[PDB]
Design a protein around this ligand. Structure first.
Ligand SMILES: COc1cc2ncc3c(N)nc4c(C)c(N)ccc4c3c2cc1OC
Length: 275
């Protein structure tokens, strides 16, 4: 029942990573479109990444939620490994933030809720993404989010994108659930302000602001959203809304900014129009 390269009509490159290339592929017998992640075995081996590739497949394989990419299958030929992944039609969240510049409160509210909900699920299974950002949050045909990219996930080292790096990661080489929550704080900021909270000339300078908590809120910034962001962007990883020392996701979803949200079925509501 194993699929082979010939079973697909390959197309366009959807993503080009360091140890990987994602190509759009159309399954011939079903007509279905998949995002097929391709990897060269020699390269992975030559690069000592077997543990990374292995962990990525396993984590994804244990995922069964609508706000997450799905691993539909896997096969390999002599030279390459193929991961049949969930195809997110409307691309990256980042794409939209740039197109319309900034999100209004309703859109920010809805999409942020889906990310909390997605994370609440992820952390429930003991998995940490630890490289969460708008580029990893895709949008399917219906404009609902689809988080992808688990090449850096952990299961309860590394370091994700500079702008979203957690303080403790720069201080103690540590990384916990609360670490994904810091990224969340950054993304919300970025959704409302239109830019990530910590920006600098170089990585070294970005990290400096991070550990110093050097950032400012625009006067426009939605108040309740500003209040939430402040309770996520806390240097102490034990005091971020959502981590277990703060008693988890219950408090976080009760935050005034989500007052209006019905958490029960986000996945089935129809997304607010991006304007
Ligand atoms: C139609 O637009 C897209 C659609 C896309 N749909 C699905 C995916 C996917 N499952 N995984 C990916 C991974 C793991 C990457 N490293 C890069 C891009 C994707 C990707 C994807 C990318 C797209 O454009 C940016």
């Amino acid at each position: 029942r194993k699929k082979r390269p010939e079973d697909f009509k390959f197309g366009k490159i959807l993503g080009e990573g360091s140890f990987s290339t994602v190509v759009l592929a159309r399954e011939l017998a079903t007509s279905r479109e998949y995002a097929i992640k391709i990897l060269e075995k020699r390269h992975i081996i030559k690069e000592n990444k077997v543990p990374y590739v292995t962990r990525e497949r396993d984590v994804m394989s244990r995922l069964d939620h609508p706000f997450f990419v799905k691993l539909y299958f896997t096969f390999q030929d002599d030279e390459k490994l193929y991961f049949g992944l969930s195809y997110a039609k409307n691309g990256e969240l980042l794409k939209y933030i740039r197109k319309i510049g900034s999100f209004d409160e309703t859109c920010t509210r809805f999409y942020t809720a889906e990310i909390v909900s997605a994370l609440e699920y992820l952390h429930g299974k003991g998995i940490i993404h630890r490289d969460l950002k708008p580029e990893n949050i895709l949008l399917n045909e219906d404009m609902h989010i689809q988080i992808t990219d688990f090449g850096t996930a952990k299961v309860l080292s590394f370091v994700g994108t500079a702008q979203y790096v957690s303080p403790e990661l720069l201080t103690e080489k540590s990384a916990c659930k609360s670490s994904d929550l810091w990224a969340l704080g950054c993304i919300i900021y970025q959704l409302v302000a239109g830019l990530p909270p910590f920006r600098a000339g170089n990585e070294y300078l970005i990290f400096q602001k991070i550990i110093k908590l050097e950032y400012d809120f625009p006067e426009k910034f939605f108040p309740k959203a500003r209040d939430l962001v402040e309770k996520l962007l806390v240097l102490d990883a034990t005091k971020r809304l959502g981590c277990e020392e703060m008693e988890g996701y219950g408090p976080l979803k009760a935050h005034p900014f989500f007052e209006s949200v019905t958490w029960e079925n986000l996945h089935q509501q129809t997304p607010p129009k991006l304007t």
